[PDB]
């Protein structure tokens, strides 16, 4: 079966524009990122400050921002959790959903920054909203039934040994909440003709989950046949950015090959799982293998690879531009 939305290839002009980076753009991204490069364990003041920063940043851009807050039992007793959901146009029937987690792992060996996991993804989502604001606010006026939604999940990480009960606290909560929140096409703005809408989950047209980004030379694969048409757009955009010479490489005549034109057989548990179980199409932008620094005290700012981050930002900007026809 074909993708429900006809995917119009990005015009050359728009590809080039979205693949342009400046000293002020790098500076802007890095300033955003600084806010996330702090320990932010569930229950901590810094976690609260990060949550408030996400909310303020998106409210300042005139997005609708909701906090899905709840208390949940954990192996460390009751803990507070708050997912942050920002929606550009709440009324639009369908959402392109970009997501990541904003909590950091409580590491027994010491203070853990989780720079790739997932400070960089968090910053990338805010950077997209900021850098594309003009075009997004214009798109919102079209009445086309599509919008952008950003979800910053809380409580992705386990408190002790990962288990079905000790992990994915925010995403399990939100998926259940949205599944139980009934709605219909008649109550929504401009749903696609062949749409089956019974609850809020059904409005998530695709969820693109970013995780463990910021290390050098990530390798992505298509994890879900259901979203192959969307994944292939990422492959194509990356190829075109390379053709245009807009990727940062250590030497001339090299190309990035982050999005492998293949699928892989690998099972990764992450925030997409509760949504996948409710039929939400998933694109999982997570490297395989994981960064070498994964869950070590070395997952810090200096182990990030800035040229890679810049290249990913270009791919993501171009992807959002293509999907929303910005």
For Zn ion, the binding residues (CB under 5 A) are 105, 117
Helices (H), 146-265: 169-180, 228-243
Pick between residue 105 and residue 285 the one whose CB is nearest to Zn ion.
Answer: 105
Nearest residue to Zn ion, scored by beta-carbon proximity: 117
Pick between residue 107 and residue 177 the one whose CB is nearest to Zn ion.
Answer: 107
Residues contacting residue 295 through CB under 8 Å, at least 6 positions apart: 105, 107, 112, 117
Q: How far is the CB of 157 from Zn ion (least distance, A)?
A: 5
Q: How far is the CB of 211 from Zn ion (least distance, A)?
A: 8
Which is nearest to 93 in space by CA: 200, 17, 4?
200
Helix (H, G, I), strand (E, B) or coil at 15: helix
Q: How far is the CB of 59 from Zn ion (least distance, A)?
A: 28
Q: Is 269 a catalytic residue?
A: no
Q: Is 156 a catalytic residue?
A: yes
157 is in an annotated binding site: yes
216 is in an annotated binding site: no
202 is in an annotated binding site: no
**Concatenated DSSP letters of 95-121:** EEEEEEE------TTS----IIIIIHH
d(CA 309, CA 123): 10
Q: How far is the CB of 222 from Zn ion (least distance, A)?
A: 22
Pick between residue 210 and residue 247 the one whose CB is nearest to Zn ion.
Answer: 210
- What DSSP designation does 83 have? E
**Cβ atoms of 207 and 280 closer than 8 Å:** yes
Pick between residue 58 and residue 213 the one whose CB is nearest to Zn ion.
Answer: 213
Binding residues: 117, 157, 295
Which positions are annotated as active-site residues? 156, 211
Binding residues for Zn(2+): 117, 157, 295
């Amino acid at each position: 079966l074909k993708w429900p939305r006809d995917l119009r290839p990005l015009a050359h002009h728009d590809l080039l524009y979205m693949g342009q980076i400046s000293e002020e753009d790098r500076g802007d991204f890095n300033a955003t990122l600084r806010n996330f490069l702090v320990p932010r364990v569930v229950g901590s003041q810094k976690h609260r400050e990060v949550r408030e920063f996400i909310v303020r940043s998106l409210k300042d851009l005139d997005w609708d921002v909701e906090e899905d807050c709840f208390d949940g039992q954990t192996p460390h007793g009751i803990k507070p959790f708050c997912n942050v959901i920002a929606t550009l146009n709440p009324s639009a029937c369908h959402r392109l959903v970009l997501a990541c987690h904003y909590d950091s792992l409580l590491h027994k060996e010491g203070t853990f920054i989780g720079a790739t996991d997932s400070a960089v993804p968090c910053a990338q989502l805010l950077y997209l909203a900021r850098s594309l604001n003009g075009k997004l606010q214009n798109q919102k006026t079209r009445g086309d039934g599509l919008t952008l939604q950003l979800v910053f999940f809380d409580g992705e990480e386990a408190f002790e040994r990962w288990s079905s009960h000790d992990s994915l606290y925010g995403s399990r909560h939100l998926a259940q909440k949205w599944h139980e929140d009934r709605t219909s096409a008649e109550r929504l703005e401009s749903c696609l003709e062949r749409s089956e809408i019974a609850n809020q989950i059904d409005r998530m047209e695709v969820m693109v989950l970013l995780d463990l980004l910021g290390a050098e030379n990530p390798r992505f694969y298509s994890y879900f046949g259901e979203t192959q048409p969307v994944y292939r757009r990422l492959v194509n955009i990356e190829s075109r950015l390379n053709d245009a010479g807009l990727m940062e490489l250590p030497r001339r005549r090299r190309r990035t090959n982050y999005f492998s034109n293949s699928s892989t057989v690998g099972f990764i548990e992450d925030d997409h799982i509760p949504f996948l179980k409710r039929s939400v199409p998933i694109v999982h932008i997570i490297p395989s293998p994981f960064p070498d620094v994964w869950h070590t005290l070395d997952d810090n700012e200096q182990n990030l690879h800035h040229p890679t981050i810049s290249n990913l930002n270009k791919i993501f900007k171009a992807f959002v531009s293509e999907y929303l026809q910005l």
